[PDB]
Amino acid sequence: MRLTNQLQYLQKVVLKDLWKHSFSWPFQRPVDKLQLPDYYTIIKNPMDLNTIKKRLENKYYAKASECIEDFNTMFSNCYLYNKPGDDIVLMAQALEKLFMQKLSQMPQ
């Protein structure tokens, strides 16, 4: 179709941009007038931006590709266990477009 640089771009640029986006709150913990069904929709995804942020702070990833797998896990779980029209899905989709744009610009 260098490891420190990749991981540093993922932390300081990619994650930063998602973290600060206005739709990232369903993908963060804690969740801060939310209805209870919607609270469950958010928290039933076992991957979130917090987990990725901590792994990046604590040198958890041996490869940048392992970081990308966590991101995939997060988006994938959203799409799998919610319906295509759902708010959480459309929000995940906008974050995912931002993620893929920024990933595309990562130095190679």
Numbering used by the authors: 20, 27 to 57, 60 to 135
What do the authors of the reporting publication say about this deposited model?
Bromodomains (BRDs) are protein interaction modules that specifically recognize ε-N-lysine acetylation motifs, a key event in the reading process of epigenetic marks. The 61 BRDs in the human genome cluster into eight families based on structure/sequence similarity. Despite large sequence variations, all BRD modules share a conserved fold that comprises a left-handed bundle of four α helices (αZ, αA, αB, αC), linked by loop regions of variable length (ZA and BC loops), which line the Kac binding site and determine binding specificity. The four helices form a deep cavity that is extended by the two loop regions (ZA and BC loops), creating a largely hydrophobic Kac binding pocket.
The insertions at x3 are present in the N-terminal domain of BET family members. Closely spaced multiple Kac sites have also been shown to significantly increase affinity of the histone H4 N terminus for BRDT by simultaneous binding to the same BRD (Morinière et al., 2009). Recently, it was demonstrated that murine BRDT preferentially recognized diacetylated motifs, whereas most monoacetylated peptides tested did not bind tightly to mBRDT BRDs (Morinière et al., 2009). Recently, it was demonstrated that BRDT requires two Kac residues for high-affinity binding (Morinière et al., 2009). Our SPOT array and ITC data showed that multiple Kac sites are generally required for specific recognition of the histone H4 tail by all human BET family members. For the first BRDs of the BET family, a spacer of two glycine residues was optimal.
